[PDB]
From a paper:
[name] from [name] K−12 (EcDsbA) was the first and is probably the best-characterised DSB enzyme to date. This 21 kDa periplasmic protein is a dithiol oxidase that catalyses disulphide bond formation between consecutive cysteines of unfolded polypeptides as they are translocated to the periplasm. EcDsbA consists of a canonical TRX domain, a hallmark of proteins involved in redox homeostasis, with an inserted helical domain.
The other three mutants, [name], E24A and E24A/[name]/K58A, were crystallised in space groups P21, P212121 and P2, respectively, with four molecules per asymmetric unit. The latter salt bridge was also abolished in the [name] mutant. The hydrogen bond between E37 and water w3 was removed in the [name] mutant structure which has the effect of shortening the distance between w1 and w3 from 3.7 Å in the wildtype structure to 3.3 Å in the mutant structure. Furthermore, the [name] mutation abolished the interaction of E37 with bulk water. [name] caused the most dramatic decrease in the initial rate among single mutants, which was 6-fold slower than that of the wildtype. To investigate whether the water network had been altered upon the introduction of the alanine mutations, we inspected the [name] alanine mutant crystal structures, which showed that although all point mutants maintained some of the w1–w4 molecules, their position was altered and the tight connectivity of waters to stabilising charged amino acids was considerably reduced. This was especially the case for [name], which lacked the negatively charged side chain stabilising the buried water network and connecting it with the bulk solvent, which could contribute to initiation of the proton relay.
Numbering used by the authors: 1 to 188
């Protein structure tokens, strides 16, 4: 049929219990993740097609970018904790990869400030137990899917998206096929 194991998706040989329904891993240092978020808008388009009541989650990973990468995973935990993922995603991607103006923890904080998150609020979150828990949560999730690279997306901790099996000659077609696969898997 249209959808086929090994084509638009693969099946984890050891599924993850309690995983988020739709789980994307990315790194602000990853060029393909920059392509996913800034040119393809994968996550916005996936969200648009998700069935009623199925929600999507993004976690940041550390195996890219060294110490700054660890800071960016903690900053993303701040963004989840504060609900500002959509305020900071673009200036964090561009600051790391486009202008290369993000080179320290302080530079990341400046992005949150300029996006409306006051400094005292950012520091409180940065040093909070909630954020520590969210860092550990992101790391545990990637380990549980034996994550080896990004970007990556998993549905119900069972199925892994396989973009290499999709048509890449037209980006809008690729995005449509990617999002329709997430829709199909979420209903499976």
């Amino acid at each position: 049929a249209q959808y086929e194991d090994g084509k638009q998706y693969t099946t984890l040989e050891k599924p993850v219990a309690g995983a988020p329904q739709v789980l994307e891993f990315f790194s602000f240092f990853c060029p393909h993740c920059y392509q996913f978020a800034e040119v393809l808008h994968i996550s916005d388009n996936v969200k648009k097609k998700l069935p009623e009541g199925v929600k999507m989650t993004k976690y940041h990973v550390n195996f890219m970018g060294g110490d700054l990468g660890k800071d960016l995973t903690q900053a993303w935990a701040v963004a989840m904790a504060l609900g500002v993922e959509d305020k900071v995603t673009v200036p964090l991607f561009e600051g790391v990869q486009k202008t290369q103006t993000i080179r320290s923890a302080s530079d990341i904080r400046d992005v949150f400030i300029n996006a409306g998150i006051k400094g005292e609020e950012y520091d409180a979150a940065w040093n909070s137990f909630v954020v520590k828990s969210l860092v550990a949560q992101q790391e545990k999730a990637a380990a549980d899917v034996q994550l080896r690279g990004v970007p990556a997306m998993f549905v119900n901790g069972k199925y892994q998206l396989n973009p290499q099996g999709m048509d890449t000659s037209n980006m809008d077609v690729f995005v449509q096929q990617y999002a329709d696969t997430v829709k199909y898997l979420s209903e499976k």
